[PDB]
């Protein structure tokens, strides 16, 4: 646990990271992995095929040219593309996600210098003076980044090429009328409440079932497509027992290939059936619509104004991108939404505390199947639970009722942050098992809560040092290796490929993953903030994470990751708030550190620190935050007038009609 | 402390209240007090002069006709006027203030019945079952009153006769321009951002100094007007030493009458001076304006929409009534406002806890002047502090920066509630002195905080019973007596009267006083809620307060009190939230009561209770709350279209121009 041991394991993890980079160098040279290494280039049509042309050499023929730059040249190349070029290449979302790693460097590097010029030399009132300085710096940089990100968001919005969302709002909870249909309701309401600029509307229908059947048709057609086109005629007609699917040759449903041909044919028949009961029925039409407007000014007005006496009816919100729209959650009434939120909030309480008890039942079952029939089963219990944590948290957000993928990801990120605050941070600082710590803190005095955890932090700082080295150095180096997506596409292009040209494209590796990646960054923000005044040694390791992660994720954002939505950096308020949380926790734990090892002569100053931070947060929530949720009316009008001068003949009607349909 | 003693003091306080009613009967029969007993009738011009004609008989000639109805007939007469008639007579604000007393009866009477049919008979799981029922009932009635009050607010707004506020917004923090003046900025911004419906604007100037001088001119003219017109020539030229004013014949400034004539003449000269530097200077013009619109729809839009990239600039808010506008607070920048808020928040922390220490210094000085030169000085210390509490809290709100009298009163009410929660409620339940209790609770476990105060409550329930009897029975009976305003006008009509006809009118007794009266009601809501499951005996006394106060305040609202502003019940969200606070506190303290006298077999149910209450609050904050802060666009449009059909020739321009000027 000493510097020697820390440095030994640092060297080990630096070498593990370097090994990962070497394998990355090797595999990025070979065409057969280039599809899932340069994905975004083919998604943008800038790269032709795999090895800049496809199916070429440069593979194991020359292996990898043994040098130092083989595994190091991708780093300056990632940093070569200008930030603005990346705003058009990848997007604003990804460019500001990169800015969180840069924010970490911008905060923790100057505070490491301060700590290593004051704290370590004199290792107190210097502790509290440094704490004050660190918080002032964090706040200054938070405000400056809030500014830059808001300016970037507004520049993006102003340079947008007629996005449908800009002119449309999502009216929800449309009150039912005995005679008038949802369509007529929306039309007449917005023709009298927003007369001048009402353009058109698109009523949301419940075509979730229809979409499911179409997607299942393709799923079944590709289920045994590998098998179908292995040799045609009668191939390996597998039987994926219908309880988990997957399997294969284990059930009793042998039949034929392409998922028993007549079965995929009956899926087409079901599509037709549902089509009738989605299009020509008027009961599938949900109480929601996408009201489009002639101007972005009027759409902004509608979104940010209350329409009727019941504020829960006619809920007009700025519509999200057609691709960001999460269609299943458009069928949720206001009252239902509120109940669902509360249900998931209390389910999360149990998820973040009493999750080890059900995990121990899974482990009891793992020992049972360990006896049954090399074995060992290393991991399972908590390991798999943590792998599926983002998925569980995502489904909880879906339950709540967020009608946009962006907001689902943002909610899942918030939940993951709280999970990791309790189970990664406090799980290490306190030796109890989540709910054990909960009970202890409930039975602890409000002054002694901070004291217990604040006295605990300096001790296991070395444990958190290894956390950065493993989950933030080697973790991000494995991200550059992209091993999992490689394997997936290897077992898709050699399995169910069946494409005329390039239609089987499983190259896309999704996006950055705000729901998972961001909570990780924020846990390191927390670690750095908490330890900065206490033990300044954590900061160097945190900074290596931030630098490495900036470069590995920049590379991925440019080369591999492809955005699924464009929120135009609307998640920055969330990021800001989580660094503010980290700041407040840091100060509380410093009051506790110097409340156990010191009395309360410096505590009055460390009690003012949280107040200042909350005041700053409130200032930032009123200064920068509204630019991320609302369209400034001036900005909207400027864009409108400019666009109306450029093109004074645009028929926004037709454009905005088909912008918001589901699978039709 | 037994039922005998409680009943003896109840009889005493019932008799004290009855004595007060008897004196009220006497004085309301005599013309010389009728001016300050039927004030609102003369303010509405419905009553001619004092004794329905003025200066008549019915005074001490017949004293008071000895009966029972002499002091009891005003009660059914108060309840005779229909609620809607009182909406036009007094106002919606006063009619919904009365509804808070009625809400108390609507909540605590059914819960007293429940408690007196279950709890007292079996005096537990009945305790927690009753707690559940009580909270469900409170919530049901809170939701139902939120509904009725919102409906009344919207009916009022829809039936308003062209109020200036409906068409105007208050833009604040207008960004400075080197060339353009504030007026031109506002004009051009709202001609391009809200082109269609921009009507006119009225830039706020800093005419606070001008107004002060005009008000001081009148003050000085009336200072020694009594003296001036006692016998004219050379009367009693008093000398109010200029350090506290008041005094009289104690300084060295004898000179002349009417505040030394040439002195009031120089005040007129100063008025002229300031007039030049307010009107013709363009630096007195503050960065704010009152932008009027052609429609209420456009004004609503402007108010509820963000205008520019900086959400802290061009802060458009629904303008308050011209008479509600607090002019001095229009000169506060956004950043300043935020700092002022935080400063006053921390000053309130010390005000609600460490206020006894400065009060003891005042008491130390009181003993010093007690020695100096019948004496005794009963009260002083805390007594006078509590008298001036609403005033102190009001000035704190003024500091913060609320630009409307309504909002100043609402803030002062919120602060007074918190003060009384800590110093009247917890001050009685815990024997410490505010900050002593603070320290104890900080050093108490989060589970034992509720336990300590929850174990304390049943003991001094009798002390709180006497509180209702004194501050809520005899207190409200003294309100009907209106002794203080009587004395004031007696020493004004016999002092500085000097009126040609009826110009010296100090009959107006102000309004209900939301900043003081409402916190009192809410403390009794708290008491009733806290004690309902524990000791049901408090409820009868609480209900007598609610009934008596309804009738005494109804009488005052009709006969005496005159509204100074019309918020159209916009303070109901505040009321609702304070009853929700009371509910949550009740449940927390019941978990503590049954955590000391019981283990934790019923605690899991009593831990769900707060969650339900917060969930209900959130539902109500999204369902009814937005109707109190925003103008529904549909409602606005309906009113506009109707009015444009009735009168299609209205020149709103001229009407809305002079609507928002200060002393000009």
UniProtKB/Swiss-Prot annotation, chains A, B:
Effect after changing residue 123 to Q: No effect on the molecular weight of OSCA1 when overexpressed in a heterologous system
Record comment: activity regulation: Activated by mechanical pressure.
Keyword Transmembrane: yes
Alphabetized GO MF terms: calcium-activated cation channel activity; mechanosensitive monoatomic ion channel activity; monoatomic cation channel activity
Segments in the Cytoplasmic topological domain: 28-99, 146-337, 398-408, 486-513, 554-571
Pfam families (UniProt xref): PHM7_cyt (PF14703), RSN1_7TM (PF02714), RSN1_TM (PF13967)
S-S bonds: none
Effect of a null allele: Impaired osmotic Ca(2+) signaling in guard cells and root cells, and attenuated water transpiration regulation and root growth in response to osmotic stress.
Entries under InterPro entries matching the protein: Csc1-like, CSC1/OSCA1-like_7TM, CSC1/OSCA1-like_cyt, Csc1/OSCA1-like_N
Extracellular compartment segments: 1-4, 433-456, 535, 595-600
Membrane topology designation: Multi-pass membrane protein
GO cellular component terms, A-Z: cytosol; plasma membrane
Expressing tissues: Expressed in leaves, flowers, roots and guard cells.
Annotated spans, Cytoplasmic region required for homodimerization: 304-309, 633-635
Record text on subunit structure and interactions: Homodimer.
Family statement drawn from the similarity comment of this UniProt entry: Belongs to the CSC1 (TC 1.A.17) family.
Protein's name in the database: Hyperosmolality-gated Ca2+ permeable channel 1.1
UniProt organism field: Arabidopsis thaliana (Mouse-ear cress)
Gene name of the encoded protein: OSCA1
């Amino acid at each position: 646990a000493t510097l020697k041991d820390i440095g030994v394991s640092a060297g080990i993890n630096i070498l593990t990271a370097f090994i990962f980079f070497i394998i990355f160098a090797f595999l990025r040279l070979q065409p057969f992995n280039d599809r899932v290494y340069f994905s975004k280039w083919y998604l943008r049509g800038l790269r032709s095929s795999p090895a800049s042309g496809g199916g070429f050499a440069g593979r194991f023929v020359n292996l990898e040219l043994r040098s130092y730059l083989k595994f190091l040249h991708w780093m300056p190349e990632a940093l070569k593309m200008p930030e603005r070029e990346l705003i058009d290449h990848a997007g604003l979302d990804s460019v500001v996600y990169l800015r969180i790693y840069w924010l970490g460097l911008k905060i923790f590097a100057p505070i490491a210098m301060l700590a290593w010029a004051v704290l370590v030399p004199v290792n107190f009132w210097a502790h509290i003076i440094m704490a004050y300085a660190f918080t002032i710096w964090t706040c200054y940089m938070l405000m400056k980044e809030y500014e830059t990100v808001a300016n970037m968001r507004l520049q993006f919005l102003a340079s947008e090429g007629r996005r449908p969302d800009q002119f449309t709002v999502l009216v929800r909870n449309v009150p039912p009328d005995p005679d008038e249909t949802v369509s007529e309701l929306v039309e007449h309401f917005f023709l009298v409440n927003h007369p001048d600029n009402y353009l058109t509307h698109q009523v949301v229908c419940n075509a979730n079932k229809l979409a499911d059947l179409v997607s299942k048709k393709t799923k079944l057609q590709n289920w045994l497509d590998y098998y179908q086109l292995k040799y045609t005629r009668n191939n390996s007609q597998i039987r994926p027992i219908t309880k988990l699917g997957c399997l294969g040759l284990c059930g009793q449903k042998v039949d034929a290939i392409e998922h028993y041909i007549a079965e995929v044919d009956k899926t087409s028949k079901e599509i037709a059936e549902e089509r009738e009961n989605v299009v020509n029925d008027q009961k599938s039409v949900m109480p929601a619509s996408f009201v489009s407007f002639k101007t972005r000014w009027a759409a902004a007005v509608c979104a940010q104004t209350t329409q009727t006496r019941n504020p829960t009816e006619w809920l007009t919100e700025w519509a999200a991108e057609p691709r960001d729209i999460y269609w299943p959650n458009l069928a949720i009434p206001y009252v239902s939404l509120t109940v669902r939120r509360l249900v998931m909030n209390v389910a999360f309480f149990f998820l973040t505390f009493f999750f080890i008890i059900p995990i121990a039942f899974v482990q009891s079952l793992a020992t049972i199947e360990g006896i049954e029939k090399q074995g060992l089963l290393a991991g399972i219990a908590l390991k798999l639970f943590l792998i599926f944590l983002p998925a569980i948290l995502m489904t909880m957000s879906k339950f709540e009722g967020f009608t946009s993928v962006s907001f689902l990801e943002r909610r899942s990120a918030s939940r993951y942050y709280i999970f990791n605050l309790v189970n990664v941070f406090l799980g290490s600082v306190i030796a109890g098992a989540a709910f054990e710590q909960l009970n202890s803190f409930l039975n602890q005095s409000p002054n002694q809560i901070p004291k217990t955890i604040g006295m605990a932090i300096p001790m296991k700082a070395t444990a958190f040092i290894t956390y950065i080295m493993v989950d933030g150095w080697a973790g991000v180096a494995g991200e550059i290796l992209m091993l999992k997506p490689l394997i997936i596409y290897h077992l898709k292009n050699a399995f169910l490929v069946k494409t005329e040209k390039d239609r089987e494209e499983a190259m896309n590796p999704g996006s950055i993953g705000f729901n998972t990646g961001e909570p990780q960054i924020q846990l390191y923000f927390l670690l750095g903030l908490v330890y900065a005044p206490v033990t300044p040694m954590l900061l160097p390791f945190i900074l290596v994470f931030f630098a490495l992660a900036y470069v590995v994720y920049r590379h991925q954002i440019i080369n591999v990751y492809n955005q699924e939505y464009e929120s135009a950096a609307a998640f920055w308020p969330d990021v800001h708030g989580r660094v503010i949380t980290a700041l407040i926790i840091s100060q509380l734990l410093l009051m506790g550190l110097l409340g156990t090892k010191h009395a309360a002569s410096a505590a009055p100053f460390l009690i003012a620190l949280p107040v200042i931070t909350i005041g700053f947060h409130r200032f930032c929530k009123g200064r920068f935050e509204p630019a991320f949720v609302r369209y400034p009316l001036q900005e909207a009008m400027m864009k409108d007038t400019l666009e109306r001068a450029r093109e004074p003949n645009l028929n926004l009607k037709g454009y905005l009609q088909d912008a918001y349909i589901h699978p039709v």
